Amino acid sequence: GTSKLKYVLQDARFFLIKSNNHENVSLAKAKGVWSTLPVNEKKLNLAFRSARSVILIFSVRESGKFQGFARLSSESHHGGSPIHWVLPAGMSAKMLGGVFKIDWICRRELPFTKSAHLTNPWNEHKPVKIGRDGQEIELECGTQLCLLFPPDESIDLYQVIHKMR
Numbered sequence: 001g002t003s004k005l006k007y008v009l010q011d012a013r014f015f016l017i018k019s020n021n022h023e024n025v026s027l028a029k030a031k032g033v034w035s036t037l038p039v040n041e042k043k044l045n046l047a048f049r050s051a052r053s054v055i056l057i058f059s060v061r062e063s064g065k066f067q068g069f070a071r072l073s074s075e076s077h078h079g080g081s082p083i084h085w086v087l088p089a090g091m092s093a094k095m096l097g098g099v100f101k102i103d104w105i106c107r108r109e110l111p112f113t114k115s116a117h118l119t120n121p122w123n124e125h126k127p128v129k130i131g132r133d134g135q136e137i138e139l140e141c142g143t144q145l146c147l148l149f150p151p152d153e154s155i156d157l158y159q160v161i162h163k164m165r
């Protein structure tokens with residue numbers, strides 16, 4: 001193991017991403033990308049410049065689980081390869097902001113039952129599973145949440161560490 005993981009998470013910022021469906025998380029995992037609404041895009045871009053790592057922790061709504069976590073490798077950009085997201089009913093692709101590149105750190109799931117002892121000070125100390133899309137997770141809570149995930153032995157954090165700057 002957990003030492004490189006702890007190194008990547010040191011002084012990181014953490015954001016809860018609430019996905020409407022599994023398809024979008026599958027796309028994010030396959031293509032290494034995420035796109036969010038402008039209100040959250042602006043926050044993530046600010047955070048990316050502010051901290052050595054910005055971690056997105058994903059949860060599919062109504063799944064009762066987190067599906068993994070990833071580190072931003074870029075601010076958002078426009079004009080790249082299109083992504084055929086399955087958007088919420090009533091939302092068009094033009095309503096999204098730009099695309100963030102992300103490097104997955106863990107593609108394994110974690111059930112909410114395992115995080116019940118973790119509360120988020122930045123959301124009224126409610127259990128960390130509770131939060132709107134884009135809710136920031138305070139450092140200690142976010143670190144402990146990430147350390148609860150099963151180790152993902154398919155991941156080598158060597159290349160992620162070299163991106164930290």
Ligand SMILES: CNC(=S)c1cccnc1
Binds near residue numbers: 024034087133
């Ligand atoms: C791929 N991004 C999706 S589906 C989304 C929708 C609404 C808010 N944030 C993100």
